[PDB]
Amino acid sequence: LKCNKLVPLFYKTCPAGKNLCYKMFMVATPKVPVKRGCIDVCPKSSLLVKYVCCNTDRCN
Numbered sequence: 683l684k685c686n687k688l689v690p691l692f693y694k695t696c697p698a699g700k701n702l703c704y705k706m707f708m709v710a711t712p713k714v715p716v717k718r719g720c721i722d723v724c725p726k727s728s729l730l731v732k733y734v735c736c737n738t739d740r741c742n
Contacts, residue, residue, distance in 0.1 A: 685742035688718055693740075696720025703742035704735030718742060 684695040685703030696703065700720035707715045710730040724735040736742045 683720070683737070683739055685720060685736070685740075686718065688715060694720065702735040702737045704733045705742065706731055706733045 683697055683701065683703065684693045686693050696719070700722045702721055702724065704718065704721050704724050705715060706717035707713055708731045716731065721735065724733050727733060734742075
């Protein structure tokens, strides 16, 4: 599988490394994307950050 990061490139493959592609923004005020990579489990927002994972391919 492969998603899109925000730092040093465009997409990334996480076939054996992980299985899903999640995002991590912060809502403390100005919604803002902070991290988007590949994980085998989506944790769970909390009070200042939410996360959006996907397992379809490119949907991230």
